[PDB]
Design a protein around this ligand. Structure first.
Ligand SMILES: *[C@@H]1O[C@H](CO)[C@@H](O)[C@H](O)[C@H]1NC(C)=O
Ligand SMILES: *[C@@H]1O[C@H](CO)[C@@H](O)[C@H](O)[C@H]1NC(C)=O
Ligand SMILES: *[C@@H]1O[C@H](CO)[C@@H](O)[C@H](O)[C@H]1NC(C)=O
Ligand SMILES: *[C@@H]1O[C@H](CO)[C@@H](O)[C@H](O)[C@H]1NC(C)=O
Ligand SMILES: *[C@@H]1O[C@H](CO)[C@@H](O)[C@H](O)[C@H]1NC(C)=O
Ligand SMILES: *[C@@H]1O[C@H](CO)[C@@H](O)[C@H](O)[C@H]1NC(C)=O
Lengths: 409, 409, 409
């Protein structure tokens, strides 16, 4: 393409891409298990495990039903002592009564305190499992979420892909025959898709099939955009007419009707092949004859006076008035296409249309408030001991007096 | 456009939109933190905190790997008393033995009951944190979910937007230069997109970049749809041929090839500018000459006999038979286009094609079953006391008898 | 279409679809409740219930704000006994002191152990509720997730659909008038869409409106793809020019400009009707005249030499060289179109372009590691008893000696 001349004719070079053919996909199947198997203690976990299983059922039942509906497609000393003996009997009884109190404590601890602590401790294990199961489900939701949400034609996540290739993106590239450029484009446009082929509700299983495309590259084939704008010819304005997309290989030109192709930032990805032969008369408009080109005179039509590409603004500021905003100055033009630079202002006016230049805004962040947590309530150790020591001191005094009396007697 | 005549020619006025140019986007970066910082007690939370951190790692590792792979693009009284003294010794021993029982209780409570309650209480704090962390992750999943699921070109959520603008949609509108009409269209077609530029797994951080478009409006520019159907000319039928989309500004007309534009309910949003000049011969078909218009005679082709817009059905019921279903009656036509109203029936037949009119269905709801929960198990207070009172009553009787004997002696 | 001849001309039969008109949608509204009502005990659940409610507020506030911003659109014996009586007093005191120790135990259990167990048990109920509420929210996230994430034009999930029709997909089909074929296509292309009309943050309610399309079928109408490739005419090559998509009904042909239609694996779903009449000259190219067809000579253009459909590769291997890779052999051609079979190799070369045939890869799986859990810590029953029995044995010996002395006295 002879741009040195084509620019004066009125056609501005636009974006440059590449050319790829979608081809036929490869397939890999994964079984995703929603319910983990927890062995060991069962009585402490059954309560939370059952509620978790119910969550899984509520999610999968609608998938199983949809797949079935869709199945076709899928002296008086004696008197004095009498008093003594009665006193001893009273202490013999007091001891027995003390034991009744001790027995009451044993009963209360053994029957009301210990059983509660043991039942509660088992319940604590259950809650721990309920938390783990909930977190596991969430991990699945971020990977196979889209597949669970709708059974057919979902975008597959990056986590699902790393599962498929066992945490190895080197293997993904070489197995599929992708370069780093192809992987970017494939993820960018969502070209990796999956479907659910079957489910089994009671086991929590889904059979998820993922299709990975096999794009092929057409060597030395570049898709080139052309953007025509009006230009001034001896006092009035004209428009040059060309196909907006032309395919250039080496020395050959053809047209592409890219109405049914996927367009990414660097490549046009088409099914089959959309290149069609180009007539001689029009080839001259790109090769350097720069005549004919069906230039049309414009009288009663709206015709563009600017074009945008890669952040730049191109405009005809010779035929009409264009100005820079917030500097309050016009832009002159001495060529038919003037380039307006983005380091003068961010808002330009061309005719009656304002063109806004994008800009960078400052950074922000998302987080939870940091919250300090206090310690658990701690029960102190039992402090009795000195009292027990005294009881022993009181007791041997009793012992000492008895031996004392036996000696005198 | 001279619709008063164009209708008789055979072209039905279709939907009316507006015209906007996508322009160049502005950028804002946010750091999203997946792991909160919890200070204070550490031993009670480390267990659940660690499992949570593991959840975050499983989600981000596939993102870090993908971004690296993609990096290039990113008397015998004495005998009688001897018996008395022996009895006293037996009670002295019984007291000592009682203390052994009390010591056993102290040992059991202090060593097996208290330590368990304290360890369990700390575990309760841990579970509380595990729940909070799980809920926090879920909040993130509903806002930055799409970004975590696939690193490139995701739709950004409304929650992510309110984070970017600090819970203020007044600022979003004025900063970007949007009207309420532009915000609706931008959200409707998913024009706000983001990408992940980098991640750091161990801190749980992702660097998420969001691009907000700067749409510009072309003043007094209306995109008008035209819908041609067949009509009867002296016994046979013809079709008028016009571009389906024409751009009308004021007194100027141009064509738009909207095959690569985004179409919303009220506006057509195109990159650059797709308006092209229109020839005089065809302008007359819209201005009021209503001749030429390349009317073509149809002999061996399938040609539409109806058109739909905004819920209405337009049809040619003069050349062919059309009927209302569930009333079992034909519709006559006396004009070439008959309008069928939707308050007569919901299903119309035009030729061999059934046209279904939509209708409103009754309301439903989604909720959990409401479940009543009972009280916790409550351990009663210790009820001993009257027994202790009796022990004291028994004891002073012992006291009273001793003083009694000392008096007699 | 006379394919028996058209193939020799240079046009390959491509994919065959069907023809449907999108029509006008029906509407059904559901109220989705994010906060369940839990009756019964309140003090044990308020803490976790409140944190849950806060989660709901953080999710819905951005929805309420967006909808408001968008509102416009929405002898010395006496001496000897004196010693005896003193000994008895010492045991009377020892008993009283023992009671003080017992009272200390009662105090400690009643004040520091029991209150903690009771407060802790109530806290256990709270944690159980916090887990249930978290799981409930997740169930919602998998069904109405997309709607919460962005208020306008979201794809509705399969779980949301089963909610709308009360777990009955038989009713969905008959109510809407869908066949199993229509349901598949509707889900495949995401044609069921919803919007949020209003929310109420404090109750956790969202008003979600779902639109279900009413597709109509055009009887005996088949959309047929045609794929032209170059062919050799007496030493040089030519390309035949036809519209890529033609509509065949019975004996009638028309063209379809499917640039604005949705294409599924079996049907083309268009708004209104895009069929346009076809001229006689070109009809002959399909009916069997197989002349004219604007065959163009190609001199300086890139022209396709192969076409792909349903996994098959068609190519011109007469004019240019094509070979099978990994067998290292050429493919000869004796017809202008050679069919390359996929059971010989998976990679073919046609000219300079490699064509990759897809293949099946082995199965994988996703699951959590299975982890065995141990038992809870269990506190043993209190083992005192034999000691108590001995205390009773010691005591009646005391009893026996006292009665013994009373007899001698
Ligand atoms: C679980 O309950 C069963 C009774 O069904 C019992 O036999 C078993 O010992 C219990 N196991 C545990 C750890 O409590
Ligand atoms: C008091 O005597 C009891 C006898 O059962 C013994 O267990 C305890 O350790 C002694 N305490 C002191 C301080 O001597
Ligand atoms: C946590 O454990 C450390 C021992 O690593 C100990 O020194 C510290 O006191 C403990 N803190 C709490 C609240 O238990
Ligand atoms: C019984 O005597 C003990 C002595 O230790 C005292 O603590 C307790 O309160 C008294 N109880 C009654 C009812 O008098
Ligand atoms: C809850 O707390 C209130 C005091 O606000 C009290 O009256 C009520 O009895 C308590 N209920 C339970 C089950 O603890
Ligand atoms: C010992 O005597 C006490 C009296 O309070 C009684 O409760 C306990 O059961 C007796 N134990 C044995 C083994 O006789």
């Amino acid at each position: 393409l002879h741009y040195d001349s084509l620019s004066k004719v009125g056609i501005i070079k636009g974006l440059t891409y590449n050319y790829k053919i979608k081809g036929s996909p490869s397939t890999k199947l994964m079984v995703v298990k929603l319910i983990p198997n927890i062995d060991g203690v069962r009585n402490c976990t059954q309560k939370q495990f059952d509620e978790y299983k119910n969550l899984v059922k509520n999610v999968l039942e609608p998938v199983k039903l949809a797949l079935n509906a869709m199945l076709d497609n899928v002296a008086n000393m004696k008197n004095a002592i009498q008093n003594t003996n009665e006193a001893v009997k009273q202490l013999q009884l007091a001891n027995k009564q003390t034991l009744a109190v001790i027995d009451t404590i044993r009963g209360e601890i053994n029957n009301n305190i210990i059983p509660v602590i043991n039942q509660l401790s088992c319940d604590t294990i259950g809650l721990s499992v309920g938390i783990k199961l909930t977190q596991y489900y969430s991990e699945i939701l971020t990977a196979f979420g889209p597949a669970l949400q709708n059974p057919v034609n979902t975008r597959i996540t990056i986590q699902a892909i790393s599962s498929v290739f066992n945490r190895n993106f080197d293997e993904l590239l070489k197995i599929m025959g992708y370069t780093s450029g192809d992987l970017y484009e494939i993820l960018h446009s969502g070209l990796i898709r999956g479907n659910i082929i079957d489910v089994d509700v009671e086991a929590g299983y889904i059979a998820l099939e993922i299709e990975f495309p096999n794009l092929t590259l057409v060597p030395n084939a570049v898709v080139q955009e052309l953007m025509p704008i009006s230009y001034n010819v001896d006092g009035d304005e004209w428009v040059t007419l060309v196909p907006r997309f032309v395919l250039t290989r080496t020395t050959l030109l053809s047209n592409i009707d890219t109405s049914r192709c996927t367009v990414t930032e660097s490549s046009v990805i088409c099914d089959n092949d959309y290149a069609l032969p180009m007539s001689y008369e029009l080839i001259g408009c790109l090769q350097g004859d720069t005549s004919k080109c069906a230039r049309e005179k414009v009288v009663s039509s709206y015709v563009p006076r600017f074009a945008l590409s890669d952040g730049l603004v191109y405009a005809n500021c010779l035929n009409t008035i264009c100005r820079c905003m917030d500097t309050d100055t016009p832009i002159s033009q001495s060529t038919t296409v003037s380039l307006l630079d983005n380091k003068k202002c961010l808002v330009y006016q061309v005719g009656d249309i304002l063109i806004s230049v994008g800009s960078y805004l400052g950074e922000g962040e998302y987080s939870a408030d940091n919250v300090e947590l206090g310690p658990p309530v701690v029960i102190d150790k039992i402090d009795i001991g000195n009292q027990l020591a005294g009881i022993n001191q009181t007791l041997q005094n009793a012992e000492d007096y008895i031996e004392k009396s036996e000696e005198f007697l």
